[PDB]
Amino acid sequence: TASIAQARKLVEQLKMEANIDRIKVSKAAADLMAYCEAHAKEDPLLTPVPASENPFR
Protein backbone atom coordinates (compact mmCIF):
# COMPACT_ATOMS: atom_id res chain seq x y z
CA THR A 1 0.00 0.00 0.00
CA ALA A 2 3.09 2.23 -0.24
CA SER A 3 2.63 3.05 -3.94
CA ILE A 4 -1.05 3.92 -3.45
CA ALA A 5 -0.04 6.06 -0.45
CA GLN A 6 2.41 7.88 -2.75
CA ALA A 7 -0.36 8.26 -5.36
CA ARG A 8 -2.67 9.68 -2.65
CA LYS A 9 0.07 12.13 -1.60
CA LEU A 10 0.43 13.23 -5.24
CA VAL A 11 -3.36 13.66 -5.50
CA GLU A 12 -3.41 15.77 -2.31
CA GLN A 13 -0.43 17.80 -3.58
CA LEU A 14 -2.28 18.52 -6.85
CA LYS A 15 -5.37 19.51 -4.82
CA MET A 16 -3.26 21.94 -2.76
CA GLU A 17 -1.61 23.36 -5.91
CA ALA A 18 -4.90 23.80 -7.83
CA ASN A 19 -6.75 25.67 -5.04
CA ILE A 20 -4.60 28.82 -5.04
CA ASP A 21 -5.07 32.48 -5.96
CA ARG A 22 -4.12 33.30 -9.57
CA ILE A 23 -3.47 36.89 -10.66
CA LYS A 24 -3.86 37.99 -14.30
CA VAL A 25 -0.63 37.79 -16.31
CA SER A 26 -0.86 41.38 -17.60
CA LYS A 27 -1.27 42.69 -14.03
CA ALA A 28 1.72 40.91 -12.45
CA ALA A 29 3.80 41.54 -15.59
CA ALA A 30 2.92 45.25 -15.36
CA ASP A 31 3.92 45.21 -11.68
CA LEU A 32 7.32 43.88 -12.84
CA MET A 33 7.63 46.82 -15.27
CA ALA A 34 6.65 49.26 -12.49
CA TYR A 35 9.38 47.72 -10.30
CA CYS A 36 12.09 47.86 -13.00
CA GLU A 37 11.08 51.45 -13.87
CA ALA A 38 11.03 52.69 -10.24
CA HIS A 39 14.48 51.20 -9.46
CA ALA A 40 16.13 52.19 -12.77
CA LYS A 41 18.37 55.04 -11.53
CA GLU A 42 19.89 53.19 -8.55
CA ASP A 43 21.21 50.32 -10.74
CA PRO A 44 25.01 50.51 -11.33
CA LEU A 45 25.17 48.02 -14.26
CA LEU A 46 22.44 49.57 -16.43
CA THR A 47 23.97 53.04 -15.97
CA PRO A 48 27.81 53.22 -15.97
CA VAL A 49 29.17 55.18 -13.00
CA PRO A 50 32.13 57.64 -13.13
CA ALA A 51 35.47 56.30 -11.83
CA SER A 52 35.47 58.64 -8.79
CA GLU A 53 32.52 56.70 -7.30
CA ASN A 54 33.17 53.19 -8.70
CA PRO A 55 35.59 51.60 -6.16
CA PHE A 56 37.11 49.18 -8.73
CA ARG A 57 38.77 51.91 -10.83
Binding site: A18, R22, V25, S26, A30, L32
Partner: peptide, 23 residues
Amino acid sequence: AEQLKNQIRDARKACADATLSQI
Protein backbone atom coordinates in the same frame (compact mmCIF):
# COMPACT_ATOMS: atom_id res chain seq x y z
CA ALA B 1 -3.88 12.58 -11.02
CA GLU B 2 -4.23 13.05 -14.80
CA GLN B 3 -7.58 14.84 -14.26
CA LEU B 4 -6.05 17.16 -11.63
CA LYS B 5 -3.10 17.93 -13.95
CA ASN B 6 -5.56 18.76 -16.76
CA GLN B 7 -7.54 20.99 -14.35
CA ILE B 8 -4.35 22.87 -13.42
CA ARG B 9 -3.41 23.20 -17.13
CA ASP B 10 -6.88 24.57 -17.95
CA ALA B 11 -6.71 27.01 -15.00
CA ARG B 12 -3.34 28.25 -16.33
CA LYS B 13 -4.73 28.64 -19.87
CA ALA B 14 -7.77 30.42 -18.39
CA CYS B 15 -5.52 32.89 -16.55
CA ALA B 16 -3.27 33.35 -19.64
CA ASP B 17 -4.76 36.70 -20.71
CA ALA B 18 -1.60 37.83 -22.61
CA THR B 19 2.20 37.50 -22.51
CA LEU B 20 5.12 39.57 -21.22
CA SER B 21 6.39 39.95 -24.82
CA GLN B 22 3.18 41.77 -25.88
CA ILE B 23 2.83 44.42 -23.14
